[PDB]
Amino acid sequence: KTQPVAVRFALVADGKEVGCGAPLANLGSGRLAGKLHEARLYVYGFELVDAKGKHTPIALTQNDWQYADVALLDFKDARGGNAACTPGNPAKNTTVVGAAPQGAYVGLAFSVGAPVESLVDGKPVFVNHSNVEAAPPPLDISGMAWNWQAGRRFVTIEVIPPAAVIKPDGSKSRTWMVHVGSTGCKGNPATGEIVACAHENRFPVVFDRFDPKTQRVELDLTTLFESSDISVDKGGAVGCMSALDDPDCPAVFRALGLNLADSAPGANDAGKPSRPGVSPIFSVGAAASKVAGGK
Amino acid sequence: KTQPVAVRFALVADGKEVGCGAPLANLGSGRLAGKLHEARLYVYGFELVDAKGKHTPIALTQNDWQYADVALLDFKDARGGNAACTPGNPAKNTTVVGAAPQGAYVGLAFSVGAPVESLVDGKPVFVNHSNVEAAPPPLDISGMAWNWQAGRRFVTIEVIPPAAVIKPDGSKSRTWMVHVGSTGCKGNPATGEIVACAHENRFPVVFDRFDPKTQRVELDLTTLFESSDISVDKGGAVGCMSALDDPDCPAVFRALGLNLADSAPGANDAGKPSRPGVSPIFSVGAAASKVAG
Ligand SMILES: [Ca+2]
Ligand SMILES: [Ca+2]
Ligand SMILES: [Cu+2]
Ligand SMILES: [Cu+2]
C-alpha cells in the first residue's frame, strides 16, 4: 500500500551548504561575515505530485520532530559549537520522513508555517495557537513561541554580524532576527475565546520536478538577507518580526514571497503569497543519491 | 592497569530531579514556576580520594565534551522542548567519563570553572582565555564565551520567569541569567599580551564520601536562586554576571560559595572560595532517582 518518503532540506548561503557551526559568507547587502545563531521553521502539508498533476499527501511519521502533518526543521547542531555539520555532530533535524501510497511521482508540494489546526485520528487539534506548554512535540518549543494569540514564530532565522546591529536610537544589539508569524491576531485563546488573524503569513512551495532520492530542498540565506543591511535595524524589532510598520520586513517578506501589507489599495492580500507556490528563498538542489550503489 | 570512571551529574530544583524541559518549581525568592533556558558549566581537575586521603587524578576521555582535563556539562535536551529527560531525548552531556589507576576509593574532588591552562601531551595550552573561534571542543561554544580577556563565562545558568524580568528603568528582558567568570582581568591575549585576573571565581568541590557507581553530583537550582527575586533585576546586567557592583550578584555568589568582593577590608580574598571545598549548590544524591538527595 505505502512506500517510505524522505524529503531532505538543506541550508545554503553564498552558494555553499551551511548549518551547524559553519560560517556564513557575504551576508546581506553589505556582504558581511556572519555567524548562524538559529535556523528553525515549521513545515506542513507535504504532498507528492504525479505526472498527471494530482497531489498525494505524505503521511508523516509521528515522532518528536513531527506531529500530525507538521514537521519542525532545525539546522543547528545540538552542541552549539563552531564546527560545520558532521555525522557525529549533525544538524538536529533536516529531513521530513513519512509514507505515501505506492506509485511513481515526479513533483513535490509543501507549505511553510504552522497551520491553525491539523487532524489526528480524524479529529482536529489547534496547532499554531496552541499552548507551547501543553502542545505535544514538536509544538512544545517555547523558543519558537510568541504567545497563543500571536501564534508561533514558525520561521526563526537569526544571524550574528561581525560588528553587531545598530538600532535607530543608536543602541547596539547582537543578533539580526527574522521571525515570521501571523499578525493582526484578535481574540485570546488563553481566555478560552476564538482567535482570527488578518495576516496568516503561511505560504506553499511547489516543485514540479523533484526526485527525493537525488535532490533536496535548499533554503538560501543569501536570498533571504539580500536587500537587508544586517548591521543596521531601521525601526521596530531588531531585524524583522512580521510587523507591517517595521521598515526591515518588506525586503524579507519579498525574499519569502509574501505580501507584507496589501500590494495594491483594496488588494486584500496582506499576509498571503505574492506568487503562490513560488518563494525566492526555496529552490531545488542536487543531493547525495539515495539510490543504493553496488560494489 | 586502569579502571573506567563515570561521574554522574544531575540538576535538581525543589527537591525534584530536573533538566531538559522539566519545569522548575518554586524558583527564586518569589517562589515562581520558572522554565530552564540554559544550564551549562565547565568542570576540571577531577580526582578520586581514598580512605587515607590521597588524591588520584582521573584522566578524561578526549571527545567533543572533554578536552585536556576540562569537561563541559549541559543539562538541556537537544530538542529544546517542554518534556523531562527521557532515554530517547536526554540531556546533552551530564556524565564526566575517563579512567583512573585501579584502587579502592571513597571520595571525589573536582573544581568548577575553566582553568587558565591545562596539559595536553605534557605541554600547556591556554583554556579559559583561548579563542572561542579557534579552540577545540568543548571550548568552541560562543554561548559560553565573553571575550578572551574576560575569559569564558564558565557557569551559564539561565531561567525564564512566568512574566518577563523587569529592569530598574521598567524595560523587560526574558531571562534571568547567572554568568560566572573571572573579572578584573587586565591585558589582552588577542594581541599577544599576558592576562591576569583579580577575581578568578573558580572553586573546588570535595565530597569525602562519593561512590560513582551508586551516587551522583547534584546541582541545586533552588539554593542558587533562593535569595534572588527572578521577576526583577536590581541593576547592572539582567541577573548576575559576576560584576562586583551588580546588586544581584551577592546572593548568587553566596550560593556558589565564592567571595564576590573582599570579605573584609584587607582580606584579599575576592573571587576566592568562601570555604574551600564546599559550595552550597553542590551535594551528593542517589544516582538512579527522581528526587534530589
Ligand atoms: Ca526592524
Ligand atoms: Ca543585575
Ligand atoms: Cu520575535
Ligand atoms: Cu553575561
XYZ file of C-alpha atoms and ligand atoms in Angstrom:
592
model
C 0.000 0.000 0.000
C 2.536 2.568 1.206
C 6.158 3.371 0.393
C 8.595 5.374 2.544
C 9.195 9.046 1.741
C 12.154 11.160 2.864
C 12.405 14.828 1.847
C 15.806 16.302 2.697
C 16.239 20.005 3.425
C 19.484 21.970 3.328
C 20.552 25.431 4.461
C 22.815 27.252 1.999
C 24.498 30.656 1.921
C 26.809 32.242 -0.677
C 26.398 29.076 -2.728
C 27.692 26.616 -0.111
C 25.865 24.297 2.272
C 25.914 25.813 5.759
C 24.297 24.868 9.044
C 25.600 23.922 12.459
C 28.762 25.922 13.150
C 29.550 26.671 9.502
C 30.470 30.296 8.702
C 28.060 32.468 6.713
C 29.894 34.324 3.948
C 28.876 37.567 2.221
C 25.593 38.053 4.067
C 23.263 40.963 3.404
C 23.700 43.973 1.159
C 26.994 44.747 2.907
C 28.367 41.257 2.188
C 29.465 40.648 5.770
C 30.818 37.576 7.541
C 28.102 36.400 9.906
C 27.566 33.557 12.363
C 24.406 31.455 12.320
C 22.604 31.714 15.648
C 19.398 29.836 14.813
C 17.608 28.429 11.766
C 14.287 26.757 12.596
C 10.974 26.597 10.772
C 7.746 24.629 10.818
C 6.627 22.969 7.589
C 3.380 21.147 6.893
C 1.076 19.724 4.243
C 3.628 17.626 2.372
C 2.375 16.174 -0.912
C 3.876 14.196 -3.774
C 2.792 15.223 -7.278
C 2.400 12.633 -10.029
C 2.789 13.088 -13.786
C -0.923 13.892 -14.113
C -0.528 16.665 -11.522
C -2.528 15.016 -8.737
C -1.448 15.601 -5.140
C -0.887 12.611 -2.853
C -0.417 13.547 0.824
C 2.583 12.187 2.703
C 1.595 10.541 5.985
C 4.229 11.937 8.340
C 5.960 9.581 10.756
C 4.826 10.536 14.257
C 7.898 11.223 16.394
C 9.447 14.063 18.398
C 10.006 16.270 15.335
C 6.721 15.568 13.508
C 3.134 15.761 14.775
C 0.024 15.214 12.612
C 1.062 16.789 9.263
C 3.515 19.284 10.811
C 7.303 18.902 10.915
C 9.971 21.063 12.551
C 13.222 21.746 10.702
C 16.302 22.776 12.698
C 19.679 23.361 11.051
C 21.769 23.942 14.186
C 23.877 21.333 15.940
C 22.998 20.250 19.467
C 26.412 21.226 20.867
C 26.347 24.803 19.617
C 29.979 24.610 18.523
C 31.901 26.415 15.799
C 32.309 23.384 13.507
C 30.358 22.520 10.377
C 27.981 19.580 10.298
C 29.310 16.018 10.668
C 27.669 12.629 11.305
C 28.877 12.822 14.910
C 27.655 16.413 15.406
C 24.836 16.863 12.872
C 22.112 19.406 12.391
C 19.228 18.482 14.654
C 16.536 17.704 12.056
C 16.769 18.318 8.296
C 14.634 15.522 6.785
C 10.860 15.129 6.674
C 10.025 11.418 6.780
C 6.808 9.573 6.091
C 4.901 7.309 3.739
C 2.832 7.754 0.587
C 0.726 5.319 -1.446
C 2.825 3.219 -3.796
C 3.391 4.589 -7.278
C 5.563 6.878 -9.357
C 5.816 10.581 -8.526
C 7.600 13.474 -10.212
C 6.941 16.570 -8.097
C 6.697 17.870 -4.546
C 4.457 20.348 -2.732
C 4.587 21.577 0.858
C 3.774 24.631 2.952
C 5.879 26.846 5.215
C 4.490 27.729 8.634
C 2.368 26.292 11.406
C -1.260 25.710 10.348
C -4.122 26.918 12.511
C -5.283 23.339 13.081
C -4.480 19.793 11.978
C -6.110 16.360 12.038
C -5.184 13.493 14.370
C -7.310 10.337 14.044
C -9.890 12.303 12.060
C -10.155 14.782 14.965
C -8.866 18.376 14.868
C -6.320 19.976 17.180
C -5.100 23.559 17.377
C -1.511 23.831 16.160
C -0.312 27.398 15.638
C -2.248 28.951 18.535
C -1.916 26.050 20.994
C -0.171 26.244 24.363
C 3.545 25.687 23.934
C 3.459 24.306 27.495
C 0.791 21.688 26.696
C 1.236 21.007 22.977
C 2.897 17.696 22.027
C 6.289 17.682 20.279
C 7.389 19.471 18.201
C 4.914 22.225 19.134
C 6.393 22.430 22.662
C 9.447 24.501 21.641
C 8.978 27.763 23.540
C 11.996 29.195 21.710
C 9.626 29.318 18.714
C 6.548 30.540 20.605
C 5.378 34.131 20.698
C 2.173 33.518 22.614
C -1.189 31.845 21.916
C -2.797 34.924 20.395
C 0.114 35.765 18.098
C 0.756 32.072 17.452
C 4.207 30.693 16.761
C 7.063 32.420 15.022
C 7.004 29.460 12.662
C 10.168 30.684 10.898
C 13.036 31.760 13.176
C 16.332 32.585 11.453
C 18.870 34.582 13.455
C 22.317 35.673 12.271
C 25.147 37.412 14.113
C 27.012 40.050 12.059
C 30.642 40.912 12.865
C 30.017 44.408 14.295
C 26.615 43.701 15.885
C 23.441 45.576 14.872
C 22.811 49.316 15.292
C 19.265 50.449 16.084
C 17.863 53.882 15.134
C 18.319 55.328 18.630
C 21.916 54.062 18.417
C 21.879 51.175 20.894
C 23.672 48.084 19.633
C 22.228 44.567 19.588
C 23.956 41.260 18.941
C 21.569 39.436 16.600
C 19.672 40.256 13.418
C 16.435 38.296 13.792
C 13.918 37.106 11.202
C 10.738 35.940 12.951
C 7.887 35.050 10.587
C 4.461 34.629 12.157
C 0.818 35.572 11.891
C -0.044 39.205 12.603
C -3.297 41.048 13.204
C -4.476 38.287 15.550
C -7.585 39.178 17.563
C -9.021 37.084 20.380
C -7.031 35.435 23.167
C -7.280 31.613 23.236
C -5.761 31.625 26.733
C -9.073 33.171 27.835
C -10.911 30.372 26.012
C -12.151 32.607 23.181
C -11.807 32.398 19.403
C -8.772 33.760 17.554
C -8.553 35.029 13.973
C -5.555 36.651 12.277
C -5.663 39.205 9.478
C -2.245 38.204 8.065
C -1.611 34.452 8.061
C 1.917 34.678 6.563
C 1.958 31.000 5.590
C 2.843 30.118 2.019
C 3.061 26.992 -0.149
C 6.143 25.768 -2.000
C 5.714 23.731 -5.193
C 8.374 21.923 -7.238
C 7.050 20.395 -10.461
C 10.256 18.337 -10.803
C 11.710 16.928 -7.580
C 13.204 13.480 -7.015
C 13.701 12.889 -3.262
C 16.383 10.251 -3.904
C 18.769 12.583 -5.782
C 17.603 16.074 -4.756
C 16.886 18.235 -1.722
C 15.121 21.477 -0.839
C 17.605 24.300 -0.267
C 16.805 27.291 1.953
C 19.010 30.113 0.652
C 20.197 32.535 3.334
C 21.793 34.821 0.728
C 18.427 35.431 -0.940
C 16.798 35.965 2.464
C 19.061 38.853 3.507
C 19.898 40.126 0.007
C 18.355 43.603 0.337
C 18.809 43.848 4.125
C 21.649 45.672 5.875
C 22.150 43.256 8.772
C 24.482 45.675 10.566
C 21.540 48.087 10.935
C 17.980 47.998 12.233
C 15.892 50.801 10.743
C 12.862 50.528 13.037
C 10.659 48.280 15.143
C 12.009 44.977 16.382
C 15.674 44.395 15.586
C 15.637 42.560 12.277
C 12.158 41.628 11.050
C 9.377 40.138 13.179
C 6.434 40.251 10.718
C 5.240 43.755 11.704
C 3.722 45.831 8.905
C 5.168 49.131 10.182
C 8.653 47.602 10.532
C 10.880 49.104 7.798
C 13.070 45.979 7.582
C 10.329 43.396 6.892
C 9.460 44.414 3.276
C 12.808 43.151 1.970
C 12.447 39.945 3.997
C 8.835 39.282 3.001
C 9.807 39.813 -0.640
C 12.517 37.180 -0.192
C 9.884 34.962 1.440
C 7.357 35.527 -1.338
C 4.746 37.075 0.968
C 2.849 40.336 0.761
C 3.644 42.172 3.983
C 0.951 44.807 3.515
C -1.554 44.949 0.662
C 0.154 45.062 -2.728
C -2.477 47.460 -4.105
C -5.181 49.550 -2.402
C -8.012 47.091 -1.879
C -5.970 44.035 -2.881
C -6.841 42.428 0.488
C -3.767 40.196 0.083
C -1.654 41.224 3.089
C -0.140 38.107 4.621
C -0.677 35.904 1.555
C 1.707 34.698 -1.171
C 2.518 37.121 -3.984
C 3.101 34.166 -6.341
C 1.644 31.027 -4.749
C 3.918 28.005 -4.914
C 6.997 30.190 -5.503
C 9.253 31.542 -2.755
C 12.638 33.009 -3.780
C 14.485 31.521 -0.776
C 13.408 27.957 -1.658
C 14.910 26.051 -4.585
C 15.778 22.517 -5.663
C 19.365 21.363 -5.324
C 21.382 18.284 -6.126
C 21.792 15.885 -3.209
C 23.743 12.720 -2.488
C 21.966 9.838 -4.187
C 19.864 7.526 -2.025
C 19.785 5.033 -4.910
C 21.763 2.250 -3.229
C 25.040 1.630 -5.021
C 26.547 -1.784 -5.612
C 30.101 -2.993 -5.041
C 46.091 -1.251 34.970
C 43.262 1.302 34.856
C 39.527 1.249 35.562
C 36.671 3.153 33.909
C 35.327 6.144 35.828
C 31.978 7.868 35.252
C 30.875 10.759 37.478
C 27.165 11.448 37.041
C 25.769 14.962 37.434
C 22.127 15.953 37.795
C 20.209 19.213 38.033
C 17.662 19.434 40.851
C 15.072 22.034 41.825
C 12.537 21.947 44.678
C 13.843 18.510 45.612
C 12.978 17.043 42.200
C 15.425 15.995 39.510
C 15.051 18.485 36.663
C 16.823 19.121 33.379
C 15.734 19.106 29.730
C 12.236 20.660 29.699
C 11.211 19.776 33.234
C 9.632 22.829 34.906
C 11.431 24.498 37.806
C 9.020 24.741 40.736
C 9.100 27.382 43.484
C 12.084 29.159 41.941
C 13.521 32.389 43.303
C 12.680 34.309 46.450
C 9.208 34.834 44.983
C 8.897 31.054 44.508
C 7.640 31.178 40.932
C 7.209 28.443 38.354
C 10.242 29.016 36.156
C 11.492 27.339 32.990
C 15.076 26.272 32.355
C 16.550 28.140 29.399
C 20.176 27.016 29.728
C 22.259 25.103 32.283
C 25.928 24.654 31.364
C 29.239 24.758 33.199
C 32.864 23.767 32.743
C 34.421 21.480 35.355
C 38.008 20.300 35.688
C 40.607 18.693 37.929
C 38.683 15.507 38.684
C 40.237 13.303 41.360
C 39.357 10.203 43.346
C 40.103 10.231 47.082
C 40.977 7.086 49.017
C 40.456 6.369 52.712
C 43.976 7.537 53.582
C 43.181 10.877 51.914
C 45.399 10.502 48.845
C 44.244 12.089 45.582
C 44.336 10.205 42.271
C 43.711 12.237 39.087
C 41.098 10.997 36.625
C 42.336 11.009 33.030
C 39.457 12.377 30.960
C 38.412 10.653 27.758
C 39.045 13.110 24.921
C 35.876 13.805 22.936
C 33.549 16.625 21.865
C 32.644 17.345 25.510
C 36.043 16.871 27.198
C 39.425 18.405 26.343
C 42.598 18.015 28.411
C 41.253 17.918 31.981
C 38.139 20.033 31.282
C 34.619 18.694 30.793
C 31.532 20.650 29.764
C 28.227 19.707 31.381
C 24.987 20.589 29.577
C 21.676 19.774 31.263
C 19.382 20.835 28.399
C 17.847 18.461 25.889
C 18.805 18.748 22.231
C 15.242 19.452 21.054
C 14.533 22.323 23.419
C 11.043 21.077 24.260
C 8.983 21.121 27.441
C 9.427 17.443 28.351
C 11.580 15.969 31.096
C 14.672 14.000 30.126
C 13.991 10.550 28.671
C 16.388 7.946 27.238
C 15.289 8.929 23.721
C 15.562 12.676 24.434
C 18.146 13.018 27.215
C 20.234 15.904 28.485
C 23.135 16.723 26.192
C 26.052 15.844 28.494
C 25.795 15.085 32.216
C 28.499 12.452 32.873
C 32.237 13.016 33.228
C 33.944 9.925 31.818
C 37.531 8.768 31.962
C 39.967 6.360 33.560
C 41.928 6.180 36.803
C 44.535 3.797 38.214
C 42.894 0.779 39.787
C 42.337 1.163 43.523
C 39.831 1.494 46.344
C 38.359 4.998 46.625
C 35.844 6.636 48.958
C 35.647 10.253 47.817
C 35.559 12.678 44.918
C 37.103 16.090 44.329
C 36.863 18.418 41.339
C 36.671 22.124 40.548
C 34.083 24.340 38.869
C 35.126 26.656 36.054
C 37.555 26.826 33.166
C 41.221 26.796 34.251
C 43.821 29.147 32.821
C 45.960 26.342 31.392
C 45.932 22.564 31.108
C 48.459 19.982 29.961
C 47.968 18.154 26.655
C 50.733 15.674 25.799
C 52.873 17.167 28.552
C 52.642 20.698 27.144
C 50.484 23.588 28.399
C 47.707 25.182 26.357
C 45.532 28.157 27.232
C 41.971 27.220 28.165
C 39.830 29.921 29.782
C 41.324 32.775 27.736
C 41.567 30.800 24.487
C 39.888 31.985 21.295
C 36.401 30.510 21.123
C 36.747 30.916 17.343
C 39.819 28.637 17.336
C 39.803 26.451 20.471
C 38.945 22.732 20.287
C 35.678 21.356 21.652
C 34.221 21.899 24.106
C 35.930 25.319 24.209
C 34.388 26.299 20.839
C 30.983 27.350 22.200
C 30.214 31.044 21.733
C 27.260 30.683 24.110
C 29.815 30.412 26.932
C 32.392 32.980 25.771
C 32.692 36.593 26.812
C 35.941 37.525 25.095
C 39.474 36.282 25.546
C 40.433 38.980 28.006
C 37.445 38.252 30.247
C 37.635 34.506 29.616
C 34.690 32.153 29.457
C 31.560 32.529 31.500
C 32.324 29.049 32.780
C 28.948 28.813 34.552
C 25.902 29.715 32.441
C 22.517 29.089 34.073
C 19.552 30.991 32.628
C 15.965 30.764 33.878
C 12.734 32.206 32.480
C 10.153 33.545 34.969
C 6.428 33.322 34.126
C 6.366 37.025 33.220
C 9.290 38.967 31.791
C 12.078 40.238 34.031
C 11.641 43.964 34.701
C 14.824 46.039 34.822
C 15.246 49.086 37.105
C 14.046 51.517 34.412
C 10.968 49.419 33.583
C 12.187 47.711 30.416
C 11.828 43.950 30.112
C 14.191 41.058 29.449
C 13.035 37.472 29.045
C 15.655 35.579 31.070
C 17.271 35.901 34.492
C 20.900 34.962 33.898
C 23.771 33.699 36.054
C 27.075 34.171 34.198
C 30.073 33.220 36.355
C 33.545 34.033 35.049
C 36.718 35.807 36.032
C 36.588 39.582 36.446
C 39.224 42.257 36.923
C 41.255 40.859 34.018
C 43.941 43.113 32.526
C 45.977 42.505 29.391
C 44.594 41.345 26.043
C 45.688 37.896 24.791
C 44.154 38.649 21.378
C 47.164 40.926 20.819
C 49.840 38.702 22.352
C 49.669 40.104 25.890
C 49.665 38.287 29.225
C 46.311 38.358 31.036
C 45.913 38.493 34.815
C 42.585 38.431 36.662
C 41.919 39.968 40.069
C 38.871 37.735 40.689
C 39.264 34.160 39.455
C 35.797 32.944 40.562
C 36.657 29.239 40.380
C 36.125 26.925 43.318
C 36.824 23.309 44.308
C 34.142 20.823 45.324
C 35.127 17.987 47.670
C 32.909 15.067 48.727
C 34.537 12.884 51.383
C 32.133 10.029 50.570
C 31.096 9.604 46.928
C 30.533 6.239 45.242
C 30.500 6.877 41.464
C 28.502 3.712 40.697
C 25.620 4.359 43.130
C 25.651 8.158 43.593
C 25.760 11.391 41.603
C 26.647 15.064 41.997
C 23.593 17.311 42.308
C 23.487 20.992 41.319
C 20.626 22.574 43.273
C 18.874 25.392 41.417
C 16.693 26.051 44.473
C 19.755 27.053 46.500
C 21.257 29.040 43.615
C 18.246 31.356 43.196
C 16.964 31.248 46.782
C 17.641 34.904 47.665
C 17.060 36.129 44.091
C 13.752 37.663 43.008
C 13.952 36.360 39.434
C 10.999 38.532 38.366
C 13.100 41.729 38.617
C 16.667 42.950 38.236
C 18.122 45.433 40.718
C 20.754 46.906 38.394
C 23.694 46.036 36.174
C 23.297 43.070 33.867
C 19.977 41.225 33.936
C 20.582 38.708 36.712
C 24.190 38.237 37.857
C 27.216 38.280 35.542
C 29.831 38.405 38.344
C 30.203 42.207 38.406
C 31.317 43.355 41.852
C 28.812 46.241 41.848
C 25.861 44.290 40.441
C 23.301 44.326 43.295
C 22.014 40.857 42.313
C 25.407 39.073 42.447
C 25.979 38.999 46.262
C 23.217 36.427 46.835
C 24.343 34.340 43.846
C 27.981 34.211 44.957
C 26.962 33.171 48.475
C 25.041 30.249 46.967
C 28.088 29.369 44.855
C 30.365 29.624 47.889
C 32.508 32.427 46.445
C 33.539 35.820 47.765
C 32.214 38.447 45.372
C 34.188 41.293 46.922
C 36.644 41.017 49.802
C 35.056 39.500 52.901
C 36.570 42.367 54.918
C 38.924 45.304 54.232
C 42.374 43.868 53.591
C 41.203 40.245 53.406
C 42.474 39.894 49.806
C 40.069 37.018 49.111
C 37.684 38.423 46.482
C 36.997 35.865 43.777
C 38.192 33.069 46.092
C 36.085 30.319 47.699
C 34.405 31.353 50.938
C 35.016 27.868 52.381
C 37.333 25.851 50.109
C 35.775 22.534 49.100
C 32.095 23.188 49.887
C 29.650 25.000 47.604
C 26.043 25.292 48.875
C 24.620 24.387 45.436
C 26.543 21.083 45.203
C 25.601 17.901 47.067
C 25.556 14.109 46.676
C 22.416 12.187 45.751
C 21.360 8.712 44.704
C 22.293 8.088 41.088
C 19.070 6.470 39.800
C 16.497 8.706 41.494
C 13.747 11.142 40.512
C 14.227 13.044 43.803
C 17.132 15.186 44.970
C 19.437 13.943 47.712
Ca 13.213 46.186 12.248
Ca 21.850 42.533 37.927
Cu 10.135 37.769 17.506
Cu 26.965 37.504 30.683
